[PDB]
Assembly symmetry: D2
Homo-oligomer: 241 residues x 4
């Protein structure tokens, strides 16, 4: 009946959301730099490129009216402000902002424009856009300045976006994951991965991709969740190290 | 295996919706409220601020099955300015709101947690889940809502230290902060508030609060957090 | 020219604020359970008792128009939700709420009512009420449920109070101290005191009472600071333990 | 001993006020802005997004005395809806706001911090203090302020991880989030915003922002925090 667009759907959180949406009955289109082998429609592209996002949005609309949009594409970075040879590189900082923040904004503006004339459902909804930030937007650790800044931008985008899109019947919600198998964790060594996981109160483990997917699906089913950032982190509050 | 649930404030509004949803989910539900009602639920009449009443309700739940879900939805409201026409905001009215909304929630949390501390962990390592109810007033209190806001801000702040400690026992603590809902709780003010909700542009339905509560119970990763359920509302001064 | 009322002025933060205000030229009245030997006016009483607060407010007004009110009276508690014999006591929880939250509200409502007819200054201000919360209102540690709850109430009171009192030209601001020599620290053993202090990024030490006083005086001198909670914590974010 | 200061955006508004206040405080002040001005300050014309320009300004400051205070007040605004009449919010306009407000602030922070990393600590153990400027829009962005809000939210989030790392070098990082100020930056919208400020019921004066910046510099305990300077304003959707 409806289509969904999931960026970053080739793996991790995006993959879980895409599979859950497919099982729920959505005609799912994945936008990712890579393609995989699940029973999903894969559009290979970059969220920072408007042409690629536009192609993915149109592909979804060809399947059915676009209702659910999940931005889960992102990159991580572990780099200190003061390095051993000099200060944090400017290009690495720019890249993280480009993918995590600009990419999310790019998907939001393009999907929203394309969904603006959707016939509303019984709740008056034309669609729902779910973005993915990180707890790093709130308790960034040493070495996470770029990542934290990019995610803080996503967090701040939530309200002004929801406020405007409310007139069009489009909700905007942000999920802020704690420690899961994502680029954040992937860019760290074992020693670091262990100590970080040890900081999570309960469940005392890495989050399961399916748990992120479950929250995303609940957001889609609950009209009252809007303009909010939901922490999915097992009560984690990251220490400096 | 069947488990029991305790819902305070279950005679009406949000608590009632949560209790009914949990019952439909298969829980053996016990309601603690100043009054009983006529739904197919087990009712214990009492006060959340009274140790004796909460213990009675907890025991009644365990009588059915091991206690797992606890939802604190009992509360009172108050609209009173700090500076009135004849004098300052009364001290007793402030104390009462704090007692019911904050101390009552803590009373239920401490007694329920103690009762579940020895439950055999479920497949997710959980011995139980406690869901408290704050309000967006804890973040954007309007003129005249100082007492209510303060009580709910206390509930918000309690979430993390409680979750941090109870984590060792496999007991989660999460808080839902509702916006404007259609609950039994001046037309002029209600209209001004309603007009401030971006989307959906209406009062929230108790069932939507219940839906969020049930998902918290089913999602192990939601813990030590406050979830705003408000249609993007940010209350202005008036 | 103006009087000031500082609760908890017998020691620590309140004492520093009282001394700083006196040096600034204010006719300072201290409300505290104890009296001391500084060149201040001491009114012995309990912030939870309206008669005592009313006596202190009137004493200040007898000296000069009451402009600055600083609520720094408070108590601490280290008690787990699940103890060795049973759950956290209800009375200990109630006591912390009574002193830290109700006491602060009591001072605010009584001082504000008494200052409501004050001739406004050049900025239109009749007075400024500064409350004291704690970072525990945001990152409460294990054993700090009661304390955190009481301080969270103070934090939440700030905005609705400032919004209403704005019409009367009275500002309401809250300072949220990190680790200082206060009841919070005083109720802990050496081992604990050391590990807590070690969590503070910079300055890597306990805050100095004079640093809290300096912020309070700046708040009094800056009309634009209102309805906000200012963290004074050396970038501390308390871990579970 | 005399120290130098670097203030970006010092040709006007908030930055100008901070620069003038620091000069009066005894600092050897260098301003980095797209244009120079006529105050008794040292001006370096450049772009905060350009490594070469920031390095030139930092070097110019060190020429006067060891760099201690850095204030990032350079920025641009934008009012643009996500959904316009002919199409969606432009991508380049969004990128530009992010580049100047967020990347520019980071560029200044990383280069200034590197330059101060070997300064002999002062009596408080400080090698320097970096004060960034966000906006309350980072918390309550209005309709049409998505780009601006996002850029400022990034500045807010940068504060803690930067302060945490730089703590080891004795360099503090604090952020000021101004509300509505009388800066060179539609009458209909400005009026609606002004009417939302509780107290003082007026536009903030640049000098009040400067006063807060100077107190941050003088108070060692203010670190890794965002201080709202907004007269209790909480921006509504419109
Ligand atoms: N620029 C990008 N465009 C689309 N997908 C991306 C981009 N950067 C990372 N991803 C994807 O994000 C998912 C991780 O969030 C990965 O599957 C990865 O391939
Ligand atoms: N002190 C209290 N103890 C138990 N239930 C209460 C209390 N105060 C209010 N309630 C209930 O809260 C529900 C509203 O939250 C109402 O059904 C009401 O009867
Ligand atoms: N109930 C109370 N009333 C007045 N001052 C108090 C109270 N409880 C603690 N204090 C004071 O608070 C200061 C510490 O905040 C101490 O000087 C102490 O004596
Ligand atoms: N990219 C930039 N680099 C330096 N100064 C800038 C930049 N963009 C805006 N400004 C300045 O910011 C001040 C406003 O914050 C203005 O004086 C303006 O000239």
């Amino acid at each position: 009946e409806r289509s969904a667009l999931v960026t970053g759907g080739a793996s991790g959180l995006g993959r879980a959301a895409a599979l859950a949406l497919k099982a729920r009955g959505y005609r799912v289109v994945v936008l990712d730099l890579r393609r995989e082998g699940e029973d999903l429609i894969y559009v290979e592209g970059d969220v920072t490129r408007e042409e690629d996002v536009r192609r993915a949005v149109a592909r979804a609309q060809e399947e059915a009216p676009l209702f659910a949009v999940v931005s889960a594409a992102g990159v991580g970075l572990a780099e200190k402000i003061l390095g051993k040879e000099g200060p944090h590189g400017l290009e690495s900082f720019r890249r993280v902002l480009e993918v995590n923040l600009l990419g999310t904004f790019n998907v939001l503006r393009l999907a929203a424009w394309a969904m603006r004339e959707n016939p509303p459902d019984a709740e008056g909804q034309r669609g729902v856009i779910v973005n993915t930030a990180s707890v790093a937007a709130f308790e960034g650790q040493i070495g996470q300045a770029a990542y934290a800044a990019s995610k803080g931008g996503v967090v701040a985008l939530t309200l002004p976006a929801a406020r405007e899109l409310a007139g069009w019947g489009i909700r905007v919600v942000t999920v802020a994951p704690g420690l899961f198998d994502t680029p954040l964790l992937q860019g760290l060594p074992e020693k670091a991965k262990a100590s970080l996981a040890a900081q999570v109160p309960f469940p005392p483990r890495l989050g399961r991709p399916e748990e992120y997917a479950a929250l995303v699906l609940h957001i889609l089913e609950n009209p009252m969740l809007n303009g909010e950032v939901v922490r999915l982190d097992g009560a984690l509050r990251m220490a400096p190290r």
